[PDB]
Coordinates of C-alpha atoms and ligand atoms in Angstrom, one line a residue:
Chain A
X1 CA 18.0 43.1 -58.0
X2 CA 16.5 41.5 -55.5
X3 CA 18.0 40.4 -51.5
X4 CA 16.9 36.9 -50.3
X5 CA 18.5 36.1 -47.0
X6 CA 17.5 34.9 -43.2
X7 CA 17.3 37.2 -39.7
X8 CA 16.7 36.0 -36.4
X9 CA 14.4 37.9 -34.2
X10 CA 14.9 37.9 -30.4
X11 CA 11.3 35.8 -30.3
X12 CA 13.2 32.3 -31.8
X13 CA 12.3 32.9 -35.2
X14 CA 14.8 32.6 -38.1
X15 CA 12.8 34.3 -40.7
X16 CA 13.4 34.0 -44.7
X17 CA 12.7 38.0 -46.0
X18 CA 12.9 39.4 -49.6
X19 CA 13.9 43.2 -50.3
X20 CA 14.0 44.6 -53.1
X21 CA 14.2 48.7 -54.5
X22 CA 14.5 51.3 -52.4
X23 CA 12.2 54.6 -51.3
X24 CA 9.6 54.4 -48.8
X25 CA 9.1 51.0 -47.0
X26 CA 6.0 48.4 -48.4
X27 CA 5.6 45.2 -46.8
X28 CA 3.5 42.3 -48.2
X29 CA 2.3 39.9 -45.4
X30 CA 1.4 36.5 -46.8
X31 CA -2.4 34.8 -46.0
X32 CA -2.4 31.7 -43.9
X33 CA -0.1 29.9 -46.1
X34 CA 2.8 32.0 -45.0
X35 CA 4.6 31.2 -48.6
X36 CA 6.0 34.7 -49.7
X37 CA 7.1 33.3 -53.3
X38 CA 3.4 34.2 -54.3
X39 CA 4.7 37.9 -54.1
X40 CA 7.2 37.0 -57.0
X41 CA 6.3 38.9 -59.8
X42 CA 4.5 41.7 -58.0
X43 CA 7.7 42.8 -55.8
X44 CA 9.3 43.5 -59.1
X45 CA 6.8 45.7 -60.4
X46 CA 6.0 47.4 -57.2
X47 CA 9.8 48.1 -56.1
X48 CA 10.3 49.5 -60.3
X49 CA 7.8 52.6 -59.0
X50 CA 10.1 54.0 -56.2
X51 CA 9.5 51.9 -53.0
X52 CA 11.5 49.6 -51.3
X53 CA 9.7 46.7 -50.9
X54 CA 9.9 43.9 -48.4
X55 CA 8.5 40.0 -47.9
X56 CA 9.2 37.0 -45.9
X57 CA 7.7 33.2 -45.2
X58 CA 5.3 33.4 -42.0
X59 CA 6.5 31.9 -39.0
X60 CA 7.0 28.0 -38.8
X61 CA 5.4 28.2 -42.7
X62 CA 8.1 27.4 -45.7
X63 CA 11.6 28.9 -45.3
X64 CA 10.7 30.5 -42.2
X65 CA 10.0 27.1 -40.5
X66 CA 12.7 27.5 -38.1
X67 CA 10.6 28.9 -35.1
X68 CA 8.8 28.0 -31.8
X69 CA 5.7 25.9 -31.6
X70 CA 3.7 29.5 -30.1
X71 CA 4.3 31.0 -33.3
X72 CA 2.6 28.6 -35.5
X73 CA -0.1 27.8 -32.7
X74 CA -3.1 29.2 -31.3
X75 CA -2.2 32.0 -33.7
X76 CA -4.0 35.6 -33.4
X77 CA -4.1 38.6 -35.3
X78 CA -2.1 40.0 -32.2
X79 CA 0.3 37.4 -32.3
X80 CA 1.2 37.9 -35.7
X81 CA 1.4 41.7 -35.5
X82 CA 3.7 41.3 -33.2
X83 CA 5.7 39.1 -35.0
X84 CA 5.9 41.3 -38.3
X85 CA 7.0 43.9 -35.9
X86 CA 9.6 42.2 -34.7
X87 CA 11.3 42.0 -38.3
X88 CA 10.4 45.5 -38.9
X89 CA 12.6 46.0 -36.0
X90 CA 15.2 44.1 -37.1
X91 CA 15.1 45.3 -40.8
X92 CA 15.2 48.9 -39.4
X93 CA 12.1 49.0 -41.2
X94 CA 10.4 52.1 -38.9
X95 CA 7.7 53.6 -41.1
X96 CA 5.9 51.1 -43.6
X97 CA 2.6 50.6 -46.1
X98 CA 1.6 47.3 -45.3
X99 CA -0.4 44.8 -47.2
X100 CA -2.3 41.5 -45.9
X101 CA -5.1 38.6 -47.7
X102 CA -6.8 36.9 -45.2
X103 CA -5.1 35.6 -41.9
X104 CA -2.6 38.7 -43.4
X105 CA -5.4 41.1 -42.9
X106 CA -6.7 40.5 -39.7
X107 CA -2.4 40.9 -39.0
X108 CA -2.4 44.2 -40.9
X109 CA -5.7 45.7 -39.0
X110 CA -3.9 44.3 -35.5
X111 CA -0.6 46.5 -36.8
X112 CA -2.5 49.5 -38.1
X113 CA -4.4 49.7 -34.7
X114 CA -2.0 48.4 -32.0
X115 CA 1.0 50.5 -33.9
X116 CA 0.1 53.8 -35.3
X117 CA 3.2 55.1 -35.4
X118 CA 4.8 52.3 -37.6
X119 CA 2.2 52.2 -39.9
X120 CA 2.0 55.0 -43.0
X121 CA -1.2 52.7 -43.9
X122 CA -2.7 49.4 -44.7
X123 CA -4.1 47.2 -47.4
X124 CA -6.7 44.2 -46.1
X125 CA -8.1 41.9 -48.3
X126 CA -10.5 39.1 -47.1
X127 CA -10.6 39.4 -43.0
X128 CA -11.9 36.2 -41.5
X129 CA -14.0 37.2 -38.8
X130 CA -16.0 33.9 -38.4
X131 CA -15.6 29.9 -37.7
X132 CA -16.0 27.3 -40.3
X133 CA -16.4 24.0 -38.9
X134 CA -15.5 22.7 -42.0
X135 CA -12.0 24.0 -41.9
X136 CA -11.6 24.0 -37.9
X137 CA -12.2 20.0 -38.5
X138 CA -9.1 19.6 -40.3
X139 CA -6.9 20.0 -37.2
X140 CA -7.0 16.6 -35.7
X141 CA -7.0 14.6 -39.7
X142 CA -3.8 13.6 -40.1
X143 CA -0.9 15.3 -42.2
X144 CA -1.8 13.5 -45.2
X145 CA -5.3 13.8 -45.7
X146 CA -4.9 17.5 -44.3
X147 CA -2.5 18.0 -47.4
X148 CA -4.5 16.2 -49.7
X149 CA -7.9 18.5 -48.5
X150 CA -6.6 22.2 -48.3
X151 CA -4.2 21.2 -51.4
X152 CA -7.7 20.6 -53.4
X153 CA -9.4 24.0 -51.7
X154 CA -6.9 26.0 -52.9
X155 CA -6.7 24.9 -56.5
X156 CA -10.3 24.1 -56.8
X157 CA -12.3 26.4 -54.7
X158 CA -10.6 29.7 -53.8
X159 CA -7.4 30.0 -56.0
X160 CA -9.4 32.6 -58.2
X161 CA -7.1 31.2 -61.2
X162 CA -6.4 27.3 -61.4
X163 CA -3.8 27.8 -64.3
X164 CA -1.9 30.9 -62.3
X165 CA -2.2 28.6 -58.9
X166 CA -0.4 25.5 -60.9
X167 CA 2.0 27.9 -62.4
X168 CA 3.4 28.4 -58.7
X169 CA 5.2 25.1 -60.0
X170 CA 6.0 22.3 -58.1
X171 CA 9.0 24.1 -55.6
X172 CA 6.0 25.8 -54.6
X173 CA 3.7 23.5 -54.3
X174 CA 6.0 20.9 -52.0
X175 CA 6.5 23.7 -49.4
X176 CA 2.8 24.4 -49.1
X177 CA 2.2 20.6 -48.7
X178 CA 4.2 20.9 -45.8
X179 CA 2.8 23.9 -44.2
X180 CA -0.9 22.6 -44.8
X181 CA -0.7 21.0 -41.5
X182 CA 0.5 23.3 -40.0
X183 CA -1.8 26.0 -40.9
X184 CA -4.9 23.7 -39.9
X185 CA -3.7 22.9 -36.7
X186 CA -2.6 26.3 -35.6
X187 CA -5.0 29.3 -37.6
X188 CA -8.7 28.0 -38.6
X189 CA -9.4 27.7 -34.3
X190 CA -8.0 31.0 -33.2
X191 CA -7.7 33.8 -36.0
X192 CA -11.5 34.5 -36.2
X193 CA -12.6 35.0 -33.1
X194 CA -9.0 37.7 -32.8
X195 CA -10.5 39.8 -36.2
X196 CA -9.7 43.5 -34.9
X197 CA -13.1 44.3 -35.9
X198 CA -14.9 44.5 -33.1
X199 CA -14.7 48.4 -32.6
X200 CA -16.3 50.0 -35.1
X201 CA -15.5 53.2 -34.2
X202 CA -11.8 52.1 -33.6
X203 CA -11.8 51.8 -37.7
X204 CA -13.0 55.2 -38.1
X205 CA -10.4 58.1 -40.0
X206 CA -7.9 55.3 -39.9
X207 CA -5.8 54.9 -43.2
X208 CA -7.2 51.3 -44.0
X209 CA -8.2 50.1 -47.8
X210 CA -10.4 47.6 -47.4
X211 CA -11.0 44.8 -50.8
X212 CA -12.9 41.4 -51.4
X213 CA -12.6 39.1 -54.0
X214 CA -14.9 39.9 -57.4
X215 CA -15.6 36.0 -57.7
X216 CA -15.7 35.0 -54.2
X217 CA -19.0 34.2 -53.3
X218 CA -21.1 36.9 -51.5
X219 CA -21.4 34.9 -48.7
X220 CA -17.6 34.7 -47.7
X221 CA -17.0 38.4 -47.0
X222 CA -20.6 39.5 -46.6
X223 CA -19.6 41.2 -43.1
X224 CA -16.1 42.9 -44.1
X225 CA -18.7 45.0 -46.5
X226 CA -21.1 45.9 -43.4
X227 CA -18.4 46.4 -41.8
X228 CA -16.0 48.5 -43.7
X229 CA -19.3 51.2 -44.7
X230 CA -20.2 51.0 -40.6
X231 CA -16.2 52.7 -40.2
X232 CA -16.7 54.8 -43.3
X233 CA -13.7 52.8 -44.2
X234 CA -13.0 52.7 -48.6
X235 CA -14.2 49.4 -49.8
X236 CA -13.6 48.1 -53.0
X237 CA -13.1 44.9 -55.1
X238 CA -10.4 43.2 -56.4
X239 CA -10.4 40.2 -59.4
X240 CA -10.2 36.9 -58.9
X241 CA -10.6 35.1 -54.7
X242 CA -8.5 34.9 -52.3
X243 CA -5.0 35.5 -53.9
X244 CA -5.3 38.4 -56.2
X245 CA -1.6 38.7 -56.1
X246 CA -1.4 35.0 -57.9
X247 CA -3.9 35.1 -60.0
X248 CA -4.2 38.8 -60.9
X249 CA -0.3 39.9 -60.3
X250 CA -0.4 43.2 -62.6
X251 CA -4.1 44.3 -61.3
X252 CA -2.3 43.6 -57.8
X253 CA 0.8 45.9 -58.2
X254 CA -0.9 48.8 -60.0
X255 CA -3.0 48.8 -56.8
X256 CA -0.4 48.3 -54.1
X257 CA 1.6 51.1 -55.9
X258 CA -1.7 53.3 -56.5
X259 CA -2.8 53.2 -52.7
X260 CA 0.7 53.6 -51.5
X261 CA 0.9 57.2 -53.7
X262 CA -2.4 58.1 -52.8
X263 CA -1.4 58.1 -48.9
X264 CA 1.8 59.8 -49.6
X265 CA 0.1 62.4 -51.3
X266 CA -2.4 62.8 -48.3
X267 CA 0.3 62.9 -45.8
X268 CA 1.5 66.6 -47.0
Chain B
X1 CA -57.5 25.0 -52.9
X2 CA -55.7 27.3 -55.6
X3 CA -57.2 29.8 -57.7
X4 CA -55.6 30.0 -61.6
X5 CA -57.7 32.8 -63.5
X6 CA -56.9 36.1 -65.2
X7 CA -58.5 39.4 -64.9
X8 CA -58.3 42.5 -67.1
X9 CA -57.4 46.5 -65.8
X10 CA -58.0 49.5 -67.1
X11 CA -54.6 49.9 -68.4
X12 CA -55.2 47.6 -71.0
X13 CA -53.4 43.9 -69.4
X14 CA -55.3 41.0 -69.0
X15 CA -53.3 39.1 -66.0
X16 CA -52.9 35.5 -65.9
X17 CA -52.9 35.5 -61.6
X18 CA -52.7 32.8 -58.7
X19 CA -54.4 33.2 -55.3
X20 CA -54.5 30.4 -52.4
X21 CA -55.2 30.6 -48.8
X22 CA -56.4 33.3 -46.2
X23 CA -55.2 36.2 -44.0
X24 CA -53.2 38.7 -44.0
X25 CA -52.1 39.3 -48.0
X26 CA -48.5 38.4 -49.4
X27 CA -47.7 39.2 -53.2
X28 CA -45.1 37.5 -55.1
X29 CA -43.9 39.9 -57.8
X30 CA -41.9 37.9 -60.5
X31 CA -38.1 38.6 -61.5
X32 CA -37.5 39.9 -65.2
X33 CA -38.7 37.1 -66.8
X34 CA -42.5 37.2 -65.5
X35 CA -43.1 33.6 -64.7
X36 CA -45.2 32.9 -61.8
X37 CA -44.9 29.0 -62.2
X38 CA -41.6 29.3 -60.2
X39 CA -43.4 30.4 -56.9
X40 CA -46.2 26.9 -57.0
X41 CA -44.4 25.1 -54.4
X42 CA -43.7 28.2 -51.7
X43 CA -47.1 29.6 -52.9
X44 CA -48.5 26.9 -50.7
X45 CA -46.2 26.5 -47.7
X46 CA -46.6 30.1 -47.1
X47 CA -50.8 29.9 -47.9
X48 CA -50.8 27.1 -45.4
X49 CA -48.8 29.3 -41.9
X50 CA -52.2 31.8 -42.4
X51 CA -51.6 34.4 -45.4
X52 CA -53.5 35.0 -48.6
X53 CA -51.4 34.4 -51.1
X54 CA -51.4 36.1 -54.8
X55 CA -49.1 35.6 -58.2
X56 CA -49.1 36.7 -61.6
X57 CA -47.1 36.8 -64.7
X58 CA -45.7 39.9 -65.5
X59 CA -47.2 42.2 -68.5
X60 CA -46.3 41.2 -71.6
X61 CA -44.6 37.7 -70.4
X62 CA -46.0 34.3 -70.2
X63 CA -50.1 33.9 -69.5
X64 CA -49.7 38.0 -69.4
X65 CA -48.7 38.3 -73.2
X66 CA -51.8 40.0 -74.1
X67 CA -51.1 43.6 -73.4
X68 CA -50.2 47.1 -75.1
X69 CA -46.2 47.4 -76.1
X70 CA -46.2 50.2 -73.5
X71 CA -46.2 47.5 -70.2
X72 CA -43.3 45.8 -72.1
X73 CA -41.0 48.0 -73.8
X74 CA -38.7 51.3 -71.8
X75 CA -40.0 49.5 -68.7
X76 CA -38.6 51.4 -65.4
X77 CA -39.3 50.1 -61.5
X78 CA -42.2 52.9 -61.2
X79 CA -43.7 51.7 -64.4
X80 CA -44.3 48.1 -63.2
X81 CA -45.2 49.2 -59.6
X82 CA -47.7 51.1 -61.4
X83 CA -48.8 47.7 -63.0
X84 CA -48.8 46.0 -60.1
X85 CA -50.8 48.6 -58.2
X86 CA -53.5 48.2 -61.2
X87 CA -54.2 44.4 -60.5
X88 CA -53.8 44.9 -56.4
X89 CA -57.0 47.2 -56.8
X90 CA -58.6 44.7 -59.5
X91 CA -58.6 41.5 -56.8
X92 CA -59.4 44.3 -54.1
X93 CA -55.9 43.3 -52.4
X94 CA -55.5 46.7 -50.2
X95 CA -53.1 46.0 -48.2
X96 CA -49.9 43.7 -48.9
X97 CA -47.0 42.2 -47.6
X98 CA -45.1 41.5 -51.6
X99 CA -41.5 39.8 -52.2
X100 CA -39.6 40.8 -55.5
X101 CA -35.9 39.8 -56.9
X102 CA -33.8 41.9 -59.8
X103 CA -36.3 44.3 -61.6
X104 CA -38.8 42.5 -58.9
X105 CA -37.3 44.0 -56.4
X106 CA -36.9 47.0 -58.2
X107 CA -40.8 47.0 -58.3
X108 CA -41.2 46.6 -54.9
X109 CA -38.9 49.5 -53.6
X110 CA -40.9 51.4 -56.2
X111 CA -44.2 50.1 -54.4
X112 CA -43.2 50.9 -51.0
X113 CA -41.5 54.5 -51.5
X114 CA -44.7 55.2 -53.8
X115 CA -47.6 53.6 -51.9
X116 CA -46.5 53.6 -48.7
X117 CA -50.7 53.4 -47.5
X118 CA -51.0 50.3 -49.4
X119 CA -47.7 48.4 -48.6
X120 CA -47.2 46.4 -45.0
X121 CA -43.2 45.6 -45.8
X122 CA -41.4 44.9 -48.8
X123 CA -38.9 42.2 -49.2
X124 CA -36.1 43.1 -52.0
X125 CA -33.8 40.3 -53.7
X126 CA -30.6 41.5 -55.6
X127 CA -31.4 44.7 -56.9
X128 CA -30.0 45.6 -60.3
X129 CA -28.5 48.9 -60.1
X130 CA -25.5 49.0 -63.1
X131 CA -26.4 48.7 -66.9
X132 CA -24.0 45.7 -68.2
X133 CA -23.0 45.7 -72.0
X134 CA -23.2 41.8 -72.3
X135 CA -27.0 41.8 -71.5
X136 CA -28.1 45.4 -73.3
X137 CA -26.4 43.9 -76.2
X138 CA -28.8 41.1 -76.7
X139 CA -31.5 42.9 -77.4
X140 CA -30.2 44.0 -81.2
X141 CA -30.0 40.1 -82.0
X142 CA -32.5 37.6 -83.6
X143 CA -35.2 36.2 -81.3
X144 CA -34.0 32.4 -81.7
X145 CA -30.0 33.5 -80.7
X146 CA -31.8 35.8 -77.4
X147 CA -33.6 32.7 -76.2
X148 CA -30.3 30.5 -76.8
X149 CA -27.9 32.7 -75.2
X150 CA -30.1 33.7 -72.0
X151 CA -31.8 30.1 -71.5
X152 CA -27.7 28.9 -71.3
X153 CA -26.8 32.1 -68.8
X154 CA -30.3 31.4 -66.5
X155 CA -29.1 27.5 -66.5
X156 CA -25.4 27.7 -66.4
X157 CA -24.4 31.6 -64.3
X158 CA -27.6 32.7 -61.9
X159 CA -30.1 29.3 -61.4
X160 CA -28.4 28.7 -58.1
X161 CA -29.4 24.6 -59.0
X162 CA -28.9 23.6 -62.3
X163 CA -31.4 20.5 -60.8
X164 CA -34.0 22.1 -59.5
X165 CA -34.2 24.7 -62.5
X166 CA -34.4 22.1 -65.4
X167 CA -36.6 20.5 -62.7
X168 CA -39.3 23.2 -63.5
X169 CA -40.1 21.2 -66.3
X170 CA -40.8 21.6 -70.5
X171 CA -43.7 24.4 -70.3
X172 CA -42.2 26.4 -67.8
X173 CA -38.9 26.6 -70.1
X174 CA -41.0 27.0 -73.6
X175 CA -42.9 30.0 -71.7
X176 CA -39.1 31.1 -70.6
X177 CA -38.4 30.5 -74.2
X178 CA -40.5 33.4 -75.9
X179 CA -40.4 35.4 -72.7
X180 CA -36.2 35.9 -73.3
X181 CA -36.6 38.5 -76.8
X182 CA -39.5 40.4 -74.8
X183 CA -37.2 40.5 -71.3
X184 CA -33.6 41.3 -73.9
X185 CA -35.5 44.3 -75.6
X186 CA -37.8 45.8 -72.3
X187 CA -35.9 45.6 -69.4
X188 CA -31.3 45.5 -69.0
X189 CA -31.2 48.9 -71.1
X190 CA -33.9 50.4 -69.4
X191 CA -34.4 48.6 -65.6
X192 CA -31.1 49.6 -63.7
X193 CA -31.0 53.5 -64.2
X194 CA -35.0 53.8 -62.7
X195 CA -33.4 51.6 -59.0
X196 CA -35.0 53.8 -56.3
X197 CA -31.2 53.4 -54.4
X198 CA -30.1 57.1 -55.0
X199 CA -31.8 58.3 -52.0
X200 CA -30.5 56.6 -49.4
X201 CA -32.2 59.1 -46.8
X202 CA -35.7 58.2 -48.5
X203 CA -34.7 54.3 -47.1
X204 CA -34.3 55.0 -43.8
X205 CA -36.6 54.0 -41.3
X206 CA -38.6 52.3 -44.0
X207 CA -40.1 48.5 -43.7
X208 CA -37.6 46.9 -45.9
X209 CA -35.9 43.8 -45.6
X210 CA -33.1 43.2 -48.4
X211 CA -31.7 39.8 -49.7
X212 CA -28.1 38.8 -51.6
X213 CA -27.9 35.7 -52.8
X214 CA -25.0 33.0 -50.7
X215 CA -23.5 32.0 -54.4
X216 CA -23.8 35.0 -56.7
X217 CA -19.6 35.9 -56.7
X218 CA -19.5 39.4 -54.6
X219 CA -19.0 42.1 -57.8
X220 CA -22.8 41.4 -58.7
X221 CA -24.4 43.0 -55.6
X222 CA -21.8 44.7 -53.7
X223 CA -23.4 48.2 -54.2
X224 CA -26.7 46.4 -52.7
X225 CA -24.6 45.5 -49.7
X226 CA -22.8 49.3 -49.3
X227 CA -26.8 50.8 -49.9
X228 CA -28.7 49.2 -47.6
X229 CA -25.9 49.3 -44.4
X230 CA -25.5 53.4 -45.3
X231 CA -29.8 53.6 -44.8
X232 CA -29.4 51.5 -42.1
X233 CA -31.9 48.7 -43.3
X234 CA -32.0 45.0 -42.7
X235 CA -29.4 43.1 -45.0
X236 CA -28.7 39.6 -45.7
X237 CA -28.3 36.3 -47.6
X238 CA -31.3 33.3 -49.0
X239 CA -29.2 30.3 -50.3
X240 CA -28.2 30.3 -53.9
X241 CA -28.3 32.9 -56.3
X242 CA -30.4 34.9 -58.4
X243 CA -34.2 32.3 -57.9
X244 CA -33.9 31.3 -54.3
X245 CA -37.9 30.2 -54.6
X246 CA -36.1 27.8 -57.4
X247 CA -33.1 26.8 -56.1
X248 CA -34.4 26.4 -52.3
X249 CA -38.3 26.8 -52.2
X250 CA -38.4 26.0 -48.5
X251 CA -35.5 28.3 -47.0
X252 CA -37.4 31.2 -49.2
X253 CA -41.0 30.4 -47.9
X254 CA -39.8 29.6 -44.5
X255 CA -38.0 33.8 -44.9
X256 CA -41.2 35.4 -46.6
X257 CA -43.0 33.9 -43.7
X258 CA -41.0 35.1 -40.7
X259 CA -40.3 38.3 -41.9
X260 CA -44.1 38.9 -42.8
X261 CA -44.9 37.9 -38.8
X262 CA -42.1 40.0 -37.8
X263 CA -44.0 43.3 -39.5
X264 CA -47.4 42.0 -38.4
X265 CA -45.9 42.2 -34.9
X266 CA -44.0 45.4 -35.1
X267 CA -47.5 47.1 -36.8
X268 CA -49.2 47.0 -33.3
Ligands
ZER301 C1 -5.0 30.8 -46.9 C2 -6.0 31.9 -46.8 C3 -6.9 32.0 -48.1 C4 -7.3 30.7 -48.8 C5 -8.2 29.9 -47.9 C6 -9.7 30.3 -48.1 O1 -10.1 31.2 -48.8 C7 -10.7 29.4 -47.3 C8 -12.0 30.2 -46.9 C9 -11.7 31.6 -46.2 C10 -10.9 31.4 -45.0 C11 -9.6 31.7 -44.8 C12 -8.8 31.6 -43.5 C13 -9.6 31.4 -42.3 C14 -9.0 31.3 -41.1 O2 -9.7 31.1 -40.0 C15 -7.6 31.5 -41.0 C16 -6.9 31.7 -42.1 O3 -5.5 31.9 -42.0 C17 -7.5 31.8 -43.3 C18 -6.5 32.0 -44.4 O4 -5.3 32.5 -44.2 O5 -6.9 31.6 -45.8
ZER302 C1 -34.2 37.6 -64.6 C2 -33.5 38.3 -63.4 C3 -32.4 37.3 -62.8 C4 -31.7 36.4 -63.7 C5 -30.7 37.1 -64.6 C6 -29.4 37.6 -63.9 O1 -29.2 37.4 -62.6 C7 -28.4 38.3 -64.7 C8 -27.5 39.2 -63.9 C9 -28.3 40.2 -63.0 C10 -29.2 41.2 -63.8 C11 -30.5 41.0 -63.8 C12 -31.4 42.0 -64.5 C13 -30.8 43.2 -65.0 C14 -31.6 44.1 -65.6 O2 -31.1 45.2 -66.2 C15 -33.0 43.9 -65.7 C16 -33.6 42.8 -65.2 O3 -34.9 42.6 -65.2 C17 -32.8 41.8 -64.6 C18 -33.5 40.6 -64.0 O4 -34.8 40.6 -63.8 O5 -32.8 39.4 -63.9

């Protein structure tokens, strides 16, 4: 069964991490929301195939809240890579698949390219590679309305599955109130303009699986399609928007686990 | 003013055709359901920046009913480029700038790989590629459950504006209305196989400019996306979905327009 506890990193953050299973190492980073209770069902499955598999709460987001303000502001892709690493580190966690939606992908690109050797190989979903005023204008609203805005994106516009999003129930949904804030006032400003996706030819060979959402609207991840057939990089959809692992958690496991044995299978 | 006529080919169609302005010539080749009334307001804004602008309804649809079963039944890409070739020489059009979405665009691909002497540029919108069971299927039902069942997806899944596509008014929909059996028996079991996408060499280099709609959720045209980056042609998005000259009349004129004067440019 399953390990829920807390580990302090030399950086200041007391992180809350999941393990469950053993075998080779698979890491799911959370998107933006940094709330690692959307994994739930999908560790389970995932972990039952042979692999040990590993989650946690993103810095100064949910149970990991316990951190300093330059974790959870003016965040990067290369901030956050470095941050994973650090509880990879402190896991003993040296060789690891690694998944990440979203501000979690632009994170697992960062690791793949900045740490080759830790990294067997990565799953991005959804890389954010350009500004939205719209979202950006949240940070200076205050914590109430910011709540009340993203609370109504998520279940409304991007969820991908309204009933699955609800079903989080309402533990869930009282820590993301708290971290909407947070999130708006630290990611929306910075994590675009630090998308490792600058160097094409930095993508190219690499072992990177690259999805979108089926029902997101073409216009969201437009470039991450350009930009994935540019690197000769394998492409692919997955159902539902931006949390496939929510709304689609048995489509999301059998791909996890799929990928994972496909690069171990490579590898020899 | 605007020219509303018809005119009869060789090949046994009588046209019901549009025409206003003068210069350089642009053609407006329908989507599957043949119906030139959706082009009236662009029709003019692009007639008045200094173009000759034609229209017709497609063989077999609409004011263009009167033709052999042939122009309408088994219908591939290089069978209505033929068509369209056949009224081009009837209105002595003999070189043309022309604009298609779905089979449309299909057509024009057709036109431009085909008569490459008579074709300036070719502007492509959502290109259907993939057969899909749900819209082959219609064509085994009754004429009356066709025209109920596509009028509701046309409204309610590709419009784009719900608004501006009830907007078009009670004799644009009762046209629509007999056009649906003709489209549901010709066309989705027939159209996708004939795409001229398989040889993505044969696209390179060409004068293509290739549209996605913003809306249309990302599974629909994906493989448009992955084609056109591998040739290396010019990809991107027109507000809304499947009838941007519907849904946004004067982002689509204001597109046909610049990217006509781009070619007109890049031909001397
Ligand atoms: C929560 C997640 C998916 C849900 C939010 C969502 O899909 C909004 C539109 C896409 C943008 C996501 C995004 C953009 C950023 O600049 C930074 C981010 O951390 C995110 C992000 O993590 O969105
Ligand atoms: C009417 C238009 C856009 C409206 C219909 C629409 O967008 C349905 C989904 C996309 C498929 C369109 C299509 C498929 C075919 O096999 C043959 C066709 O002629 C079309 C087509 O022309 O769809």
């Amino acid at each position: 069964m399953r390990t829920r506890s807390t580990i302090s990193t030399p950086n200041g953050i007391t992180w809350y991490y999941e393990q469950e299973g053993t075998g080779p190492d698979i890491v799911l980073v959370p998107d933006g929301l940094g709330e690692c209770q959307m994994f739930d069902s999908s560790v389970s499955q995932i972990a039952a195939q042979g692999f040990r598999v590993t989650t946690f709460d993103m810095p100064g987001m949910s149970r990991s809240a316990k951190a300093p303000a330059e974790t959870y502001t003016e965040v990067t892709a290369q901030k956050l890579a470095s941050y994973v690493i650090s509880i990879l580190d402190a896991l003993d966690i040296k060789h690891a698949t690694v998944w990440g939606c979203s501000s979690g992908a632009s994170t697992v690109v960062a690791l793949l390219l900045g740490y080759p050797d830790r990294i067997r190989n990565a799953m991005c979903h959804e890389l954010p590679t350009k500004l939205l005023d719209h979202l950006s204008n949240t940070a200076v609203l205050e914590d109430e309305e910011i709540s009340n805005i993203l609370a109504n994106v998520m279940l409304n516009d991007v969820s991908g599955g309204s009933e699955a999003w609800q079903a989080l129930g309402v533990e869930v949904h009282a820590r993301l109130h708290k971290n909407y804030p947070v999130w708006a006032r630290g990611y929306p400003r910075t994590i675009p303009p630090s998308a490792p996706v600058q160097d094409v030819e930095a993508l190219r060979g690499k072992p990177l699986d690259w999805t979108v959402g089926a029902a997101t609207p073409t216009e969201s991840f437009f470039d991450n399609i350009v930009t994935a057939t540019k690197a000769g990089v394998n492409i692919g959809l997955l159902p539902g928007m931006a949390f496939p692992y929510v709304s689609h958690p048995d489509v999301f496991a059998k791909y996890v686990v799929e990928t994972t044995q496909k690069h171990l299978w490579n590898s020899s």
